[PDB]
Symmetry: C3
C-alpha cells in the first residue's frame, strides 16, 4: 500500500505537463522518502530526473518500495480531469497493476475516482553522477524560456558561451544569425570557476522549458564536454532536473 | 408577415451555436405565441426541442403561421456578423423564401441587414410525450459540461446511476476507468438538487452529451431527467423566454 | 551607414505583421528624411506604401541613400524575438549585405543581436500618382476590420456604395446576401465616422485583399478610405508622429 495526499494538486498537473512531451513511459519509484522518477528520452539525448519528497505531501504512506510503470501521456490526460484547485490523492495496493487517482473538489460535494492501468517496464535506472560545474547560472525561468524559444526560430542549435561578465546564447541558420547576451544584475547570477563554451540542440531545451510553471527561477550548470543540467525547484517538495548531452 | 425584435441578441447567437453541431437543417415554426423548433439529429439518436415565447421578445408580430426551413450552419454564420451587444430583429415578408436578420449596433450608427435564403423541408414533426421522471437532477451547467468532457477522455459511454444521497457518472476504456460522484448541497451559499421517486441506472453516448453542453452559455443551471429505459432529458432554461431541451435515447448492446 | 533607434519598438513589430501577409520581399528605401517602402503583391492586384519619417525615430542617421532588399517574412520572424517593450535599433554598415537588428530589454540586462541577410531586388518602383478623391471616409479601424471580416463570410467581393448620408458595404454568395450601412456621427474622434463626398461612387473589391490590409489595424485607432470611380481604393493607417501605411486595391470587374 501507498497513499499520498497533495492539497496543491496543480503541482502534479504541472509536473506531468513537463514530462509527457519528453517521455512516453516511465517508472515511478515509490519509497518512504518519496517519489523518484528518472528516465531518458526515446532518442537517448537527454535524461530527466524528478524528486518529490514525502514531507512535501500533506500525508504520505509508503509501506513497500514500488516501481510503478506509467504511461505519462495517459496519466496527464487523467490529471486534466482534475480542477486546478482540487485535492489529489494517489493510491496503489501492494500487488497492483493499477494506480488510483482521486480528485476532491474544494466544494466537497464532488469526488472523482480514476483507476489507471499500469505497465511493465524494465528500467534498470542509471544516472548522471553528482559533480561541481565550471559554470552555474541562475535566472528567471520565463527569461530562459523566451531565449530558447526566440533562438529556435533562427537555428536548431544554440552555442552557450559563459565568461565572467555574463553569458551568451547564439544560433545560426537559413535566415541569418542571432545572439543574446545576459549580464549579472528577477536577478541573474553567475558562478564561474572557468570559462566554457558548449553547443546543444534547441529542440530539447524547448521540451525542458515546459517545466517553467513550476518555478520562478532556473539553474543551468555547465562544464566542458559534459551534459548541461537544467534544474527547476519545486518549492518545499523537490526538483525537476534535465540533462542534455552536448552536440558534436 | 413576421417581425420579432429581441430582448437581447446574444441569446440567439448561443441558441444557434448550441444547434448547428447537432442539426444541419431544421424548421422554425413561427406563430402568434412564438418560435418553436423540433428536430432529430441525422443519426436518429437524439431529439432537440426549442421554445421561444413571443412575450420574451421586445416586440413580436406574426400575422400568419410559418414553417421556415433553415440551414442552421448558414444562420449561425450570419449571426457571427452580429456584435454581442447588437439588437437583433428577424423579419420575413408574406411571400418569403428569405429570412431577414437585422443587427443594430448600440451606437446607432451601424445597421447591418442579412437576407438568408430559405428552403422547403417536409418535417412532419413527432415528439416525446410529456411525463414525470423517476429522477430529476438540477445542477450548475458548467459542472455538468466538465463531467461529460472529463469522462469522454476515458470512454465513449457514461453510466449514470441515480440513488438518493447523490448521483454517479462512470466510464471505462483503454486507459482505465473513472467515476464522478455528486452529492446534494444541504448548506448552500451553485447548488446540486435531486428528486428521486425511484433509483435508476442508464447508459448514454458521451459524444451526444458533449453536443448538448454547447448550450451551456444559455443558463447557469441544467436539469437532467431520467427513468428506466427512456430518453434522458437535458434541459436549459432560457430565462423568461423558453427553453432548449435535448432528448437522448439510452445505449444498448 | 545607417542607424535608426526606435524606443517604441512595438511599432515596427506591427508594421511587419501588417506587411508580411501581403508581400514576401520588398525594398526599403533609406534616406536622410527616413524610410520609404513601396511594393505590389505578387498577384499585382494591390500596392502597399510605407512612410516612416526620420524625425519619428529617437535617433536617425543615414549617410547615403539606399535600396535594401529585405525578406519581410524573415524580418517579421526576427522581430518576434523582440519584447513588446524592447528598444529597437536597425543598423547597416557601409557596403554590407546584412541588416543588424538590436533589441534592448527594459531591464537593461538583456541585449539581443540579430543579423539578417539582405537580397538583391530589381524593384524599379512605380506608384499611384497623388490625387483628390470623390469620397473620403474616416472611421474606427476596428469597425472597418469587423465589416470586412463579417462580409467575407458572405461572399468574396464587396460592393462599396458611397452616398452623402452614409456609406454602404454589401456582398453576396451561396448563403444569401448582406449589407452594412454606416451613417455619420453628430464621445471622441476615435469613435466617429466622417464622410466627405464630392460625388457619389460605387465600387467592387476583393475582400481577400481588404482582410490583408486590416492586419495594420493595431497601428491606428482610425482608418481612412478614399474612392473615385474606376480607380484603386486607398486604405490608410496613420502611424502617429512617424508616417503612414497606405494600401491601394484595384477595383474588380
Amino acid at each position: 500500500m501507498f497513499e499520498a495526499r497533495l492539497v496543491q494538486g496543480s503541482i502534479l498537473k504541472k509536473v506531468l505537463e513537463a514530462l509527457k512531451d519528453l517521455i512516453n513511459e516511465a517508472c515511478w519509484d515509490i519509497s518512504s522518502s518519496g517519489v523518484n522518477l528518472q528516465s531518458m528520452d526515446s532518442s537517448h539525448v537527454s535524461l530527466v530526473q524528478l524528486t518529490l519528497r514525502s514531507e512535501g505531501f500533506d500525508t504520505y504512506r509508503c509501506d513497500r518500495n514500488l516501481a510503478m510503470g506509467v504511461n505519462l501521456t495517459s496519466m496527464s490526460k487523467i490529471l486534466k480531469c482534475a480542477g486546478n484547485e482540487d485535492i489529489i490523492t494517489l493510491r496503489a495496493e501492494d500487488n497492483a497493476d493499477t494506480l488510483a487517482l482521486v480528485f476532491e473538489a474544494p466544494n466537497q460535494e464532488k469526488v472523482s475516482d480514476y483507476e489507471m492501468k499500469l505497465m511493465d517496464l524494465d528500467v534498470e535506472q542509471l544516472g548522471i553522477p553528482e559533480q561541481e560545474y565550471s559554470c552555474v547560472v541562475k535566472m528567471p525561468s520565463g527569461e530562459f524560456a523566451r531565449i530558447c524559444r526566440d533562438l529556435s526560430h533562427i537555428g536548431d542549435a544554440v552555442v552557450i558561451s559563459c565568461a565572467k561578465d555574463g553569458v551568451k546564447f547564439s544560433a545560426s541558420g537559413e535566415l541569418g544569425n542571432g545572439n543574446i547576451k545576459l549580464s549579472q544584475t528577477e536577478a541573474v547570477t553567475i558562478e564561474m570557476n572557468e570559462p566554457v563554451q558548449l553547443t546543444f540542440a534547441l529542440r530539447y531545451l524547448n521540451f525542458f522549458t515546459k517545466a517553467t510553471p513550476l518555478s520562478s527561477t532556473v539553474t543551468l550548470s555547465m562544464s566542458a564536454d559534459v551534459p548541461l543540467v537544467v534544474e527547476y525547484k519545486i518549492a518545499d517538495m523537490g526538483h525537476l532536473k534535465y540533462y542534455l548531452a552536448p552536440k558534436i
